[PDB]
Design a protein around this ligand. Structure first.
Ligand SMILES: FC(F)(F)c1nnc(S)n1/N=C/c1cccc(Br)c1
Ligand SMILES: [Ca+2]
Ligand SMILES: [Ca+2]
Ligand SMILES: [Zn+2]
Ligand SMILES: [Zn+2]
Length: 231
């Protein structure tokens, strides 16, 4: 779509004055090329990243795009669970000197999932909000653990000062006919987790997700409606 920029294999789209979506693609062999989206946030004199790309090389291209187009240091990255689309590029972040954060559970599961763990672990209260001492200096990033759904470790992030919340792989677009890859899913708690994400970011009107283009809040309720049928 017009307005989008390509750098290498990555596509970028501005969502807000200080927010961009990054999109990377993995070619399952002779199968569907599969898109995955993350976010880039300009916070004053620094940049914050949400999710790697599928690969280290694709991840370096994110970082090089930021250097060329924004020209501010990346202070940290938060990754949203231990699958290849979200943590495939951790080695690239580390090679670049970025501090990395993930749900403690993501870091614990990372080895079995064939992912490199992030450096630092987020933990969460019973109400789902990140324990702030584990997410120091996150600026406008508000990190919320909605409960198990796409995976037991899936986390979400709202961007304060914008209309944007990022549901990662938990949320599907409002015309989706399935819930995608359920290989690590919790089918019993999924619906409640989708709804909890909506409740955490009641003011968000643009919902960004890993595997569809940004949607309205309709994505949340539609996802929950699908998930209701798993139980
Ligand atoms: F549209 C799809 F199919 F891409 C999708 N929608 N929701 C989910 S989750 N997916 N797939 C996610 C996925 C596919 C291959 C490998 C890994 Br690791 C994750
Ligand atoms: Ca690697
Ligand atoms: Ca798995
Ligand atoms: Zn996933
Ligand atoms: Zn995914």
């Amino acid at each position: 779509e017009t307005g989008d920029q390509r750098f290498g294999d990555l596509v970028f789209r501005q969502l807000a004055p200080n927010v961009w979506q990054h999109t990377s693609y993995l070619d399952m062999p002779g199968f569907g090329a599969v898109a995955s989206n993350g976010l880039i946030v300009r916070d004053g004199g620094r940049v914050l990243v949400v999710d790697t790309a599928w690969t280290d090389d694709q991840t370096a291209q994110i970082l090089n795009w930021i250097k060329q187009e924004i020209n501010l240091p990346v202070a940290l990255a938060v990754v949203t669970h231990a699958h290849q689309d979200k943590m495939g590029g951790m080695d690239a972040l580390h090679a670049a000197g970025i501090a990395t954060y993930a749900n403690a559970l993501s870091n614990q599961l990372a080895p079995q999932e064939g992912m490199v763990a992030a450096q630092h672990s987020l933990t969460f209260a019973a109400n789902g909000w990140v324990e702030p001492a584990t997410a120091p200096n996150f600026g406008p990033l508000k990190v919320f653990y909605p409960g198990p759904g796409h995976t037991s470790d899936n986390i979400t992030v709202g961007i304060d000062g914008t209309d944007i919340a990022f549901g990662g792989c938990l949320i599907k677009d409002s015309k989706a006919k399935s819930l995608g890859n359920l290989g690590d899913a919790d089918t019993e708690h999924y619906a409640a987790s989708a709804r909890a994400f909506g409740a955490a970011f009641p003011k968000a009107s643009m919902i960004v997700m890993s595997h569809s283009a940004p949607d309205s809040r309709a994505a949340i309720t539609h996802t929950a409606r699908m998930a209701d049928k798993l139980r």
